[PDB]
Design a protein around this ligand. Sequence first.
Ligand code: RSM
Ligand code: RSM
Length: 145
Amino acid sequence: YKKPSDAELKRTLTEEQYQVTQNSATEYAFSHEYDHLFKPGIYVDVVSGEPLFSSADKYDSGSGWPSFTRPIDAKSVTEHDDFSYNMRRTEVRSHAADSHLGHVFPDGPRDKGGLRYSINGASLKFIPLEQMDAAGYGALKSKVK
Ligand SMILES: CNC(=O)[C@H](CC[S@@](C)=O)NC(C)=O
Ligand SMILES: CNC(=O)[C@H](CC[S@@](C)=O)NC(C)=O
């Protein structure tokens, strides 16, 4: 409920950020750095800068995309069913900017809830633990492992 026009996004995002978040174009498995990033911090929507994921919940599923057991809060994302490409899938988008993020699957680690949020790295901006104050995310420094 807080998204710019596509033309504004076209001039402010990279081609990969644009195609993934605005056209739901899945990045190639293993292609984004965030697939192999495991440092403390938060992952935010590239469009709104709203907090989406904590480093605490990030894990390697071996899929080739950033994987998380949960969003930072259920409120941060919007999920819906998708029956395209002949599949039953649940798409995940950010709440405020409504960016396409990826999909959620019921094959995540059971000790952490059983869900795998499979997210394009291109849909995210990583904010390191240390920069979280300077960038306005002080109050979430404690969701971070
Ligand atoms: C290759 N990755 C896995 O098998 C991951 C690792 C889980 S975490 C909690 O370290 N497990 C699953 C179910 O994807
Ligand atoms: C079973 N895997 C898929 O359907 C994945 C979705 C990954 S998340 C990042 O949307 N898509 C492809 C094209 O392999």
